[PDB]
C-alpha cells in the first residue's frame, strides 16, 4: 500500500494546509484576498471549455475501456471451455463502446459552441462568455463522469453475464436487462449535458 500511502499523505497534507490557510485568511481579516470571484473571472473561459470537451471525450473512453477489459477478460476466460461466449456476449462490449460514442457526440456538440472573444477585461468578456465556459466545463464533466460510471457498471455486469453464460446458455438473455439499465445512465448524462449547453453561446 505504498502508493495509497503516498496519495493519502498528499491528500491529508493538502487539506490540512487548506484548513489552516482558511483559518488564517478569515482570522487575520485577509479574506478579501481570497477572491474566488477574481479566480473564476480572470481564469480564461477557454480553459474551462476545452477542459470540458477533453474530459467529455477522455473519461467516456476511460469508462468504455475499463468496462471492455473487465468484460473481455471474463469472456475470453470462460470461452476456453465454452467458445460460444465469444460469439454471443459481444453485446456487452458493444454497450461499453456506445458509451464512448456518446462521449464523442457530446464532445462535438460542446465544441460547436466555442468562439473567441477578442477581450480580456471581465466586463468585456461578459456573463455570456463566462457562463458559456462554465457550462461547457460542467457539461463535459457530466457526460464524461456519467459515461465513465456507466461503462464500468456495464463492464462489471457483462463480466457477470459472461461467467453465468459459460455455465447455462439461457441466462444471458435475461441478464442483458441489467446491462440495459446500466446503459441508461450514459443516456441520462448525455441528456443533461445537452440541456446544460442548450443556451450556451461564446463570442
Amino acid at each position: 500500500t505504498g502508493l495509497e500511502l503516498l496519495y493519502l499523505g498528499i491528500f491529508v497534507a493538502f487539506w490540512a494546509c487548506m484548513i489552516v490557510v482558511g483559518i488564517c485568511y478569515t482570522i487575520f481579516d485577509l479574506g478579501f484576498r481570497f477572491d474566488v470571484a477574481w479566480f473564476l473571472t480572470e481564469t480564461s473561459p477557454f480553459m474551462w471549455s476545452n477542459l470540458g470537451i477533453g474530459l467529455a471525450i477522455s473519461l467516456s473512453v476511460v469508462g468504455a475501456a475499463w468496462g471492455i477489459y473487465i468484460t473481455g477478460s471474463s469472456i475470453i476466460g470462460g470461452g476456453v471451455k465454452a467458445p460460444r461466449i465469444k460469439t454471443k456476449n459481444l453485446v456487452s462490449i458493444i454497450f461499453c463502446e456506445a458509451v464512448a460514442i456518446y462521449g464523442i457526440i457530446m464532445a462535438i456538440v460542446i465544441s460547436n459552441m466555442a468562439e473567441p472573444f477578442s477581450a480580456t477585461d471581465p466586463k468585456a468578456i461578459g456573463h455570456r462568455n463566462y457562463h458559456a465556459g462554465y457550462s461547457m466545463f460542467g457539461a463535459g464533466l457530466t457526460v464524461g463522469l456519467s459515461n465513465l460510471f456507466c461503462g464500468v457498471c456495464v463492464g462489471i455486469v457483462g463480466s457477470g453475464a459472461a461467467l453465468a453464460d459459460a455455465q447455462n446458455p439461457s441466462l444471458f438473455v435475461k441478464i442483458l436487462i441489467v446491462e440495459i439499465f446500466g446503459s441508461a445512465i450514459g443516456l441520462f448524462g448525455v441528456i443533461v449535458a445537452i440541456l446544460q449547453t442548450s443556451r450556451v453561446k461564446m463570442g
Binding site: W66, Y69, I70, S73, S74, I75, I76, G77, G78, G79, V80, K81, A82, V152, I156, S159, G160, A162, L163, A166, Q167
Partner: protein
C-alpha cells in the same frame, strides 16, 4: 467495500473465468447417478468418458483398478491446479501456494517419519502428494539426519514460518508425528485466515466462512478422537485453530470436554453445527459426523461460487474436485467390492 469489481479482472479475470469453466465440469447429480448405475470398473470408465473427464483413463491398462483410477484423478487435478498457478500472478499465486501448503504439511510429516525410521528421503519422495512436491534440493540427500532435514525445512521450504511453533529440531524426535502435523496445520490455517482477511473484500467475505468451518470441524473431530488416547486436554487444546467461531469459550469448553455428550452440548450453542451433530447419528446405517461435516463443507464451497470478484473460487474448486475424486473412487470401490448398498454414501456436488 474494497470495490474489487474495478481491478480484479486486470490480473485474475481470465483465471476467474477459467476456474469457473473448470467447475462447470464437476459431475452433477445426474452424472453421479449414471456412474452409480454401473456394474464394473470398465463400465465406470465408459460412463465417465461422457463427462468432462473424457479419455483420461483410456491409455491405462484394461484391467482397471481403484488405485489406478484414484491416481489418474489425482494427476488430472494436479495438472489443472498447476496450470492455474503457472498462469496466476502475485496475490493469487500466494493464495494457490497457501492451498498447496496443506499437502506440503502431510509431505513433510512423511519425510520426517521416514527419516526418523532411517529410510531414504529420495525413496520417500514418490509417496508424497504431487501438489506439495518439495522441488527444493536442500531437503534431499539429507543422509537420514533429522537435524539436517529440520535445517533444510527451515531454510528452503515455505513451512519455516509454521515450524517456529516448535522450539528446536529435537522436537521432531520428541513429539508424536500426529501432534506435529496438527500443530503445523493449526499454524497454517491461522496464517491462511490472516492472509485472506488482509486480502479483504469479496475474497475475505467468501473465504473466511470456509476457514472458520474448517477450524470448528478440526476442533470437534480432534476432541472426539482424542477421548480414549493419551493426548491430554492441555496438549489437545493447543491443536484447536483459533480461526473458528468457537474461539471465545467454545474451544475452552471443548478442551475441558471429557465425552461426546459434552462435545454435543458445546456444539448446541451454535445452530449451524447443532444440525450437523443432530444428524450425525453415528450408529450403523446413517450419516456419520464426518459425513455431515463433508456435506456442510461442500455446501460452503458451492456458496463460494455466488460471489464473483474473489479468489475463494479457486480454493472452493480445488476442494470440490477433491470431493468429486473421492466420490468417484468410492463408487469404484463399491463396484469392485459389490457393496452396492452403501453406494449412495457419496456426497453430491451441484
Amino acid at each position: 467495500s474494497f470495490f474489487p469489481e474495478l481491478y480484479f479482472n486486470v490480473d485474475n479475470g481470465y483465471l476467474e473465468g477459467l476456474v469457473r469453466g473448470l467447475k462447470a465440469g464437476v459431475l452433477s447429480q445426474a452424472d453421479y447417478l449414471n456412474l452409480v448405475q454401473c456394474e464394473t470398473l470398465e463400465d465406470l470408465k465408459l460412463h465417465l468418458q461422457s463427462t468432462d473427464y473424457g479419455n483420461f483413463l483410456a491409455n491405462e491398462a484394461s484391467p482397471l483398478t481403484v488405485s489406478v483410477i484414484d491416481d489418474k484423478l489425482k494427476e488430472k487435478m494436479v495438472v489443472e491446479f498447476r496450470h492455474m498457478r503457472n498462469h496466476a500472478y502475485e496475490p493469487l499465486a500466494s493464495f494457490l501456494d497457501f492451498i498447496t501448503y496443506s499437502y506440503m504439511i502431510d509431505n513433510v510429516i512423511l519425510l520426517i517419519t521416514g527419516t526418523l525410521h532411517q529410510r531414504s528421503i529420495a525413496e520417500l519422495v514418490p509417496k508424497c502428494h504431487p501438489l506439495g512436491s518439495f522441488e527444493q534440493m536442500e531437503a534431499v540427500n539429507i543422509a537420514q539426519t533429522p537435524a539436517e532435514l529440520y535445517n533444510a525445512i527451515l531454510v528452503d521450504t515455505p513451512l519455516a514460518a509454521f515450524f517456529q511453533d516448535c522450539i528446536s529440531e529435537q522436537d521432531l524426535d520428541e513429539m508424536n508425528i500426529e501432534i506435529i502435523r496438527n500443530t503445523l496445520y493449526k499454524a497454517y490455517l491461522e496464517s491462511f485466515y490472516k492472509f485472506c482477511t488482509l486480502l479483504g473484500g469479496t475474497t475475505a467475505d467468501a473465504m473466511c466462512p470456509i476457514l472458520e468451518f474448517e477450524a470448528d470441524r478440526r476442533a470437534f473431530i480432534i476432541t472426539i478422537n482424542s477421548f480414549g488416547t493419551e493426548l491430554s486436554k492441555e496438549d489437545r487444546a493447543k491443536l484447536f485453530p483459533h480461526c473458528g467461531r468457537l474461539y471465545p469459550e467454545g474451544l475452552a469448553q471443548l478442551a475441558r470436554a471429557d465425552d461426546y455428550e459434552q462435545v454435543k452440548n458445546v456444539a448446541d450453542y451454535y445452530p449451524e453445527y447443532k444440525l450437523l451433530f443432530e444428524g450425525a447419528g453415528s450408529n450403523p446405517g446413517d450419516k456419520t459426523l464426518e459425513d455431515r461435516f463433508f456435506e456442510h463443507e461442500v455446501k460452503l464451497n458451492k456458496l463460494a461460487f455466488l460471489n464473483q470478484f474473489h479468489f475463494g473460487v479457486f480454493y472452493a474448486f480445488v476442494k470440490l474436485k477433491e470431493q468429486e475424486c473421492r466420490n468417484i473412487v468410492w463408487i469404484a470401490e463399491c463396484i469392485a467390492q459389490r457393496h452396492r448398498a452403501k453406494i449412495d454414501n457419496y456426497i453430491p456436488i451441484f
